[PDB]
Write a protein that binds this ligand. Structure first.
Ligand code: 5EP
Ligand code: ZN
Length: 267
């Protein structure tokens, strides 16, 4: 496809899932060739792997002492819509979690797409590659389209699950919420994560139940969300991606490890 930006400024506001702090986003149009970058306190922070500064339960970006937490969801939506040139101005310390999924971002941005002149410079996976970490694995291989599978194993009623995204089916993942398990709640709070979490923005799972009043959106919503996360982390390659991906129990750390190896292999 062709490069894209937004037709006009868009803003989003709300609590961040981990900080519990209120923040605001303003998405600014940019011309062809600009790329995706964040902006905070006078500092531009490109949405690229070189600027990743944390990968524990979220992907955080930083530069010159300016940090932005949890970029993976907004990046995933921008990757799926192939928005290639914007500046995401951030006031605060974290991207708002909103409903827990990509939906509100997706809905608003989809309505405001502006086509540009330049052909997208896709990052094309050119040969098989695999990264591993003690029973976690991500592999990639060449493909003309973006296809992403995540397979997980959960110590509850979900059991082993997997989902495959194929180009054109973004509605099957953009509403999958971020999630947490009830037995991990005490820990994540002790280490200061999930301070903004609630049943209004997080799928909370138990041994044989879901805490949320509305329950699961899909029987395999958590692995759908993991696919959504991986597509967000893949956009740290610096442009939309063409390849077939399989992640077994991968997290943001392994996701970014894959991106870094792909970048290193290309050069
Ligand atoms: C690694 C992938 C993972 C899914 C990740 N999400 C998280 O790490 C995560 C960790 C903790 C929470 C939380 C909370 C809470 C609550 C709460 C609710 C109701 C009551 N009554 C009380 C408390 C949410 C998300 C993610 O999406 N990354 O992109
Ligand atoms: Zn996520």
């Amino acid at each position: 496809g062709l490069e894209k930006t937004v037709k006009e400024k868009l803003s989003f506001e709300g609590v961040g899932i981990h900080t519990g702090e209120y923040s605001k986003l303003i998405i600014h149009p940019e011309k062809e060739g600009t790329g995706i970058r964040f902006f905070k306190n006078g500092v531009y922070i490109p949405a690229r792997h070189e600027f990743v500064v944390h990968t524990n339960h979220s992907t955080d970006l930083g530069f010159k002492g300016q940090r932005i937490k949890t970029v993976e969801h907004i990046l995933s939506v921008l990757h799926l819509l192939e928005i290639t040139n914007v500046t995401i101005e951030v006031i605060g310390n974290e991207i708002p979690i909103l409903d827990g999924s990509g939906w509100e971002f997706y809905e608003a941005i989809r309505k405001n797409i502006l086509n540009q002149n330049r052909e997208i410079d896709y990052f094309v996976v050119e040969e098989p590659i695999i990264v591993e970490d003690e029973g976690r694995l991500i592999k990639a291989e060449p493909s003309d389209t973006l296809e992403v599978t995540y397979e997980g194993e959960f110590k509850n009623f979900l059991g082993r699950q997997k989902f495959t995204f194929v180009e054109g089916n973004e509605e099957e993942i953009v509403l999958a919420r971020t999630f947490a398990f009830d037995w991990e709640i005490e820990h994540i709070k002790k280490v200061g994560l999930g301070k903004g979490g609630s049943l209004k923005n997080t799928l909370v799972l138990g041994k044989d139940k879901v805490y949320n009043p509305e329950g699961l959106r899909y029987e395999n919503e958590p692995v759908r969300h993991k696919v959504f996360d991986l597509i967000g982390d893949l956009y740290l390659l610096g442009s939309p991606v063409k390849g077939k991906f399989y992640s077994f129990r991968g997290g943001h750390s392994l996701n970014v490890k894959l991106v870094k190896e792909l970048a290193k292999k290309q050069k």
